[PDB]
Amino acid sequence: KCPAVCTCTKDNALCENARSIPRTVPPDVISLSFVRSGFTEISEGSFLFTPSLQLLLFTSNSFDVISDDAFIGLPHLEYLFIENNNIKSISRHTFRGLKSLIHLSLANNNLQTLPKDIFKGLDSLTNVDLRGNSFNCDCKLKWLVEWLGHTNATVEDIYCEGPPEYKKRKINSLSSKDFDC
Amino acid sequence: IITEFAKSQDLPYQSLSIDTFSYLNDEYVVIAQPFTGKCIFLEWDHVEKTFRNYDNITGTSTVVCKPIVIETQLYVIVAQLFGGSHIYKRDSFANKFIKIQDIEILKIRKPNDIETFKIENNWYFVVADSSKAGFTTIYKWNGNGFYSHQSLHAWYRDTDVEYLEIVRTPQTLRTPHLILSSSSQRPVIYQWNKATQLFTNQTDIPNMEDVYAVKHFSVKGDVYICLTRFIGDSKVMKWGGSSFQDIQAMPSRGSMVFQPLQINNYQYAILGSDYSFTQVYNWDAEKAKFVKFQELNVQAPRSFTHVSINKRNFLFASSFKGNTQIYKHV
Amino acid sequence: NVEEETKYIELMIVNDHLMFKKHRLSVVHTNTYAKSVVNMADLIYKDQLKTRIVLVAMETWATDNKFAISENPLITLREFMKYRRDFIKEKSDAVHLFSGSQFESSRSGAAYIGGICSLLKGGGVNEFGKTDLMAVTLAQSLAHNIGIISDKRKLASGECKCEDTWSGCIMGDTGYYLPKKFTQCNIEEYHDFLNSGGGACLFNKPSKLLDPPECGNGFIETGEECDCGTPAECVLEGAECCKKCTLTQDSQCSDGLCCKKCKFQPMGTVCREAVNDCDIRETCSGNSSQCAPNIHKMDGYSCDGVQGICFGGRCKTRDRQCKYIWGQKVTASDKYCYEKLNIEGTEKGNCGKDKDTWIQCNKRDVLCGYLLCTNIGNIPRLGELDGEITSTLGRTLNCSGGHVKLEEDVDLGYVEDGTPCGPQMMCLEHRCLPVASFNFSTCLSSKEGTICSGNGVCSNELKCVCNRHWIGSDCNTYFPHN
Ligand SMILES: [Ca+2]
Ligand SMILES: [Ca+2]
Ligand SMILES: [Ca+2]
Ligand SMILES: [Ca+2]
């Protein structure tokens, strides 16, 4: 049933200060949240037991590493809001299997770099949010420039925080060849 | 010292709308409880320092209970999803509510919001009808009842209606306006025609699609509006004289309410969330924008109402899935 | 029986140019949106109606609209059905239009009542909205297609009421709080429609979908040999037959009516008994996991006694029409009413609504004109009274009628075409015309003026359902066997 650490509801659970990922959450919920939780590492197969999740949210957490392909068992997840956290490392294959994700948020995570081809396979994406970050616009970030210039999903404006010669301009305005590094 | 919202009471029932009014030099609170069909009236206990239950109006599925005070007489507009909507009058002699009028079921079918306003010493209320068959209708008080005045937005599923007064700028005076929010449509602004006594000149608010609700506030003579989006970006816009221009955008995760509140000449905005915490915003006068102030833990907030009692300020948060909460601004 | 089996609506969705525009001019976005709508509608249907909504085809009008979309849902429905008859060629149970425009009526969509499994009526039109709201709209349109209507008589009489006072029910007008459940009367109406022979095309399980195969969806597609669906309910049936979408050594099936205990049920066993007179019993073939598709007698056979002719597997009479329009207590009025009212009458007996002189029905057969019933109430089960109820009086007979309309221009107050006005004699357009005018097809018969060489019933697909132990194609050779 509902964990004592989570303030669940009929179709929504709000796990605050949880030190581990709940596993016995009732299968009637379609929205799970994690605010200021204790666990600092999302491992593979942490959401297999809850196939009814249509919305997943993380806020104000502190994450060291999110493991490869951590969102298996969610074939109906349409919204994924991993925002306001402090993630030191995000894995390339993290969003594997999310063929129905229409909205994905990675805002205010203080991220400085993103692994190459992390958004591949998300054909259903209609809105990607990446504000509040400190991405370094250099030779390790051609893929995001190309994807932003080639994708059709609505991505809001984001700003560079890398080299002094690439300060305060839209990555959408960056060119694939223009990378002095 | 700094201010903050401290929890005061937990009322063990769900609610959709919470309203306050002044009746005979006393302050009252009306709570619409959806699943029991009750308009719960609360009064301030001057002895126990609590909000005591005052009276009840029994319905079937009540979404709104709007109180209207017309010349020291209290009328309550009760909107019901089932069994039709009715109008009640407070009979102070017997200390009970008497049903004085019935709204036609064919006209108002699926109400979602009621807004009351006064134009030139005339009292009106607008019901937002969320069904295609039912139209958003304006009712006018003629001295002994409320009768239909105008239907506005035909074949649309209106979810919210907002009354505000803004200065269009070929002029200098401030004129009445109505803003209608409907499903899958842009918000619509109506302008009051003094000659024909009707709301005319339908105009859309651009770039804002599927806004659930609009609520306005004033900062030093400038009128702003808070735009409510369920999932996406809730926005604040400023009236430029002929149109609204974006001021800032806010992350919305299950947001059904974006309420501006003015407490002790301080401008606040509370953005609800069904999937995360509820964020209270403070207006930064120097930056002319809202800044994060505090987080509230309320289960599926539906409305936020400020109550002032003999220099004590209370915040009523209506919870659709849990216990409606009362906060104190300390 | 018909109520425990699972029904499958093979649905095809057409997105017009406005719906294409509403999704940023992208085909993939429109397809994904429509798939989500169909999936939520299927979720609504499977729980209560025991029916699956399967999306088998789709087309999007990326260039422009093939016809003018009107703000009237009924005109749009008529035009879309004409287009589907003339241009759409995919095989499906229903063809519904997803329109990006907004209709100027009380309804978010229009569909033909009981018109499923029909080329001319099997479809509807729906207007754009939120995925959940538009899923509800598609659900109610398909419910109209499968004979589910909001019974005005019982709703006014309070015989049945929606159990949800907050969100209402699906058949009612929709507000912000969307309905989720059908009334019990809606379930009963669906069961009555199924028991009357309707929806005979819903008993085949789709083999090809628009979705990539999933291990546990339920449908056996290419490559897959067995599919019992989700393992949660696979324990009840098919647990020992299919595992991980793979056969368990010696196995013949995964599920199905014609296959028990992982073994082909012997040929000749009954998988579907006839629901009425026009239906044909289905027997297992001995080498198939699912029962044979629901076939019935062809259009032309006699049902009940002599008062009805099968049309789509359903008996078509005047008493049944009276009950369908007014109520179960209502019965067809006596032939005395017809022969003494339709010959000479105004607003009480006629065969047309011409304003000049109405219609003076000829005494050849006046059973094809005004529908006169007995014990007619004040309001009909469905439609709208175009006028006032007729009331006309050695026997005294209560005799009444009406002018109920519907989604089309057809007047329900007149006798439906195809109703028997005599022996070998059946109505057509307010005129009792011979059966040869209807141009009914026949199976292969060897004798003179017979059906399948005498012994044998001609099915709806124009194949001879031979009698017991007659293997021959035209039912001519007796082959003993067991
Ligand atoms: Ca309002
Ligand atoms: Ca079929
Ligand atoms: Ca499959
Ligand atoms: Ca059959």
Numbering used by the authors:
A (entry chain D): 41 to 221
B (entry chain B): 222 to 551
C (entry chain A): 233 to 625, 630 to 718
What is the paper's account of this structure, in its own sentences?
LGI1 is a 60 kDa secreted neuronal protein that consists of the N-terminal leucine-rich repeat (LRR) domain and the C-terminal epitempin-repeat (EPTP) domain. Meanwhile, the S473L mutation of LGI1 causes epileptiform seizures due to reduced binding to ADAM22, which is a member of the A disintegrin and metalloproteinase (ADAM) family and acts as a receptor for LGI1 in neurons without protease activity. The ectodomain (ECD) of ADAM22 consists of a metalloprotease-like domain, a disintegrin domain, a cysteine-rich domain, and an EGF-like domain. As such, the LGI1–ADAM22 complex maintains normal nerve signal transduction through the interaction network, including synaptic ion channels.
We also determined the 3D structure of the LGI1LRR–LGI1EPTP–ADAM22ECD complex at a nominal resolution of 2.78 Å. Nonuniform refinement using the particle images with the original pixel size yielded a density map at a nominal resolution of 2.78 Å. This map corresponds to a part of the 3:3 complex, where two-thirds of the complex may adopt various conformations. In the cryo-EM structure of the LGI1LRR–LGI1*EPTP–ADAM22ECD complex, the LGI1EPTP–ADAM22ECD structure is essentially identical to that determined by X-ray crystallography. At the interface, Trp398, Tyr408, and Tyr409 of ADAM22 are stacked in a layer and project into the hydrophobic inner rim of the central channel of LGI1EPTP, which consists of Leu237, Phe256, Val284, Leu302, Tyr433, Met477, and Phe541 of LGI1. In addition, several hydrogen bonds are formed between LGI1 and ADAM22: Arg330 and Lys353 of LGI1 form hydrogen bonds with Asp405 and Glu359 of ADAM22, respectively, whereas Arg378 of LGI1 forms hydrogen bonds with Ser340 and Thr406 of ADAM22. The hydrogen bond between Asp431 of LGI1 and Lys362 of ADAM22 was also found in the cryo-EM structure. Specifically, Glu123 and Arg76 of LGI1LRR form hydrogen bonds with Arg474 and Glu516 of LGI1*EPTP, respectively. The hydrogen bond between Glu123 of LGI1LRR and Arg474 of LGI*EPTP is reinforced by stacking with Phe121 of LGI1LRR. The present higher-resolution structure demonstrates that Arg474 of LGI1*EPTP forms a hydrogen bond with Glu123 of LGI1LRR, which was ambiguous in the previous moderate-resolution crystal structure. No tight interaction was found between LGI1LRR and ADAM22ECD in the cryo-EM structure of the LGI1LRR–LGI1*EPTP–ADAM22ECD complex.
